[PDB]
Amino acid sequence: IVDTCSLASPASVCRTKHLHLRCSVDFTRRTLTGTAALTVQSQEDNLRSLVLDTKDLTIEKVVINGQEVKYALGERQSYKGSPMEISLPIALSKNQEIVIEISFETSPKSSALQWLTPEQTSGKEHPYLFSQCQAIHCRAILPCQDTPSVKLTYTAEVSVPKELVALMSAIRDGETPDPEDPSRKIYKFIQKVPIPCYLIALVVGALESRQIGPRTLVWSEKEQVEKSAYEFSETESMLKIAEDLGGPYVWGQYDLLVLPPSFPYGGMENPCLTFVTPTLLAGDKSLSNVIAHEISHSWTGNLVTNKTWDHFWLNEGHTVYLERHICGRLFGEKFRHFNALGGWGELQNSVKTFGETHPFTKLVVDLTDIDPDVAYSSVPYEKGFALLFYLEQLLGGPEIFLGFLKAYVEKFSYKSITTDDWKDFLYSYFKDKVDVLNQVDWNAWLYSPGLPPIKPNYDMTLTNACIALSQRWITAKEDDLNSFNATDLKDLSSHQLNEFLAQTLQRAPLPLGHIKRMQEVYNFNAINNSEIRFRWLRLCIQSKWEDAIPLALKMATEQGRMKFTRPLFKDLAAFDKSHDQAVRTYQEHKASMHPVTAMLVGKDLKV
Ligand SMILES: O=C(CCCCCCC(=O)Nc1ccccc1)NO
Ligand SMILES: [Yb+3]
Ligand SMILES: [Zn+2]
């Protein structure tokens, strides 16, 4: 097994056991500067050198046993960064540990980091910094074996301007004034559970907290605290359900941090401190499945981890499966099936977008010479989910398959694993149903592009109204438009309204007159729920409604969740009326965008 996204020595040569990070966040220079002390364990006899990943890091020196040592940085390999070879001063025997202290500074263009000016924040007085290391951005913060095949504990001391707060994916372990600079405070952290380095995270800004459960604080700027506390109030109930499904929660606290709007993902499962988009702040808790997802990664991802990124689906697909059980326990089995079926629709979309023979539609993907951020899609989520839901149905239902899931989490806790590890364990657990498992077309599900070979069975109860209303609109002629009215929506939940629009969007464009009628009778322009507004605006732009141009440009730029920003820019570029403005808008905003989002939007727009 080779990690084709990492240039570091593999785990078979040496393993990092601990990181102690001492750093200072310099907002004037947009640099993090300090020392990364790696405790490294040789796995070989006579070990005399090793290699770490880095990306846009300036290295000042490397210290082992109190003396500077030789090191060299290799040529940059695009998104992978530059390998750093370190010459050890004394050859190591197998299992010997040493500490390697590297003094480094980050680049302002670090792909792991977004540096925000005061104007870019809610409070407008103070700047803000946040990280996003998954998949392979930790190397752009500090030198490391930047591979999920290696798990380490960490401690950290972070010096920041004294008016600001630092938080990490770790337990808070104190704060004191910085003795080197009384304008600063050092915040300390400890992560005692071994983690892959993609789970290292840092935020610095003017943060406040509010308790919302026995093991949960919400953190955000002051302006968002009250709304966030309400929106995420189900979090303890979800954690309790998740513990029933997965076993004990091992991480101590489960805090939430609500980022500024350019955070690129819905959420990120950083241990102890899940990061979430403010786009979840719908006002009615309706987008709480994202919280259930991130919670679920406390087991599937954070405890049992993909050994390399080719096996991402292990992390995401199992998380989606647990996510959907939490939501089904809370809101009912009919809702689990509704969400499940919605997920298949998203998979349909992704397969159509890439093409049915595209490599990135395989469940296990080969990332040789592929930047994960470019290949990122709904495929691992939803083809993964569909496999597990198909297995659930084959093997005797949800209670049975949940016994497997708990057993799997137990078996592989604290480890990093491959698809074949998972498959082997599935066969071991279900050894009395091997004949059933042998009906599965493993090669097609795991290794073939396109839609899966079999579609699961779904309860249609909550979906039927959505499909019926979509079909009414699609089949309407001009003389049927008058028949639509606001009462059509009266028995539909926000989730159903979303699914009505996703179903309709799958047949877009519709006639411009239909779309104008839809606004006249349903007033979708008034809905601030981000998922609904996203699909509505896509529907309007694809249907060539010029009045939607400013609305779509506004949503694309006022937040930066890539789920929303990328397809809105792409749709606006594809509409001749908005094309030039879309490209100008991107060009104007690009320097102030998150670095990954900026990259991908530029690729999408061919800029
Ligand atoms: O699932 C999420 C949202 C995505 C968070 C970022 C994932 C980045 C990543 O690991 N990308 C990737 C990995 C493998 C293959 C392709 C992309 N939160 O839990
Ligand atoms: Yb030896
Ligand atoms: Zn996830």
Swiss-Prot record:
One of its GO terms (cellular component) is extracellular exosome. Changing D373E: Strongly reduced aminopeptidase activity. Abolishes epoxide hydrolase activity. Phosphorylation at Ser-413 inhibits leukotriene-A4 hydrolase activity. A peptide binds at Q132, C133, Q134, P264, Y265, G266, G267, M268, E269, R561, M562, K563. Zn(2+) binds at H293, H297, E316. InterPro entries: Aminopeptidase_N-like_N, Aminopeptidase_N-like_N_sf, ARM-type_fold, LTA4H, LTA4H_cat, M1_LTA-4_hydro/amino_C_sf, M1_LTA4H, Peptidase_M1. Its EC number is 3.3.2.6, 3.4.11.4. Isoform 1 and isoform 2 are expressed in monocytes, lymphocytes, neutrophils, reticulocytes, platelets and fibroblasts. Changing R561 to A/K/M: Abolishes epoxide hydrolase activity. Reduced aminopeptidase activity. GO terms for biological process: leukotriene biosynthetic process; lipid metabolic process; peptide catabolic process; protein metabolic process; proteolysis; response to peptide hormone; response to zinc ion; type I pneumocyte differentiation. The record marks D373 as: Essential for epoxide hydrolase activity, but not for aminopeptidase activity. The keyword Cytoplasm applies. The modification N6-acetyllysine is found at K70, K334, K411, K570. Changing D373N: Abolishes aminopeptidase activity. Decreased epoxide hydrolase activity. The modification Phosphoserine is found at S413. Its cofactor is Zn(2+). Changing E294A: Loss of epoxide hydrolase and aminopeptidase activities. The active site is at E294 (proton acceptor), Y381 (proton donor). Binds 1 zinc ion per subunit. Bifunctional zinc metalloenzyme that comprises both epoxide hydrolase (EH) and aminopeptidase activities. Acts as an epoxide hydrolase to catalyze the conversion of LTA4 to the pro-inflammatory mediator leukotriene B4 (LTB4). Also has aminopeptidase activity, with high affinity for N-terminal arginines of various synthetic tripeptides. Belongs to the peptidase M1 family. Monomer. This is Leukotriene A-4 hydrolase. It comes from Homo sapiens. The gene is LTA4H.
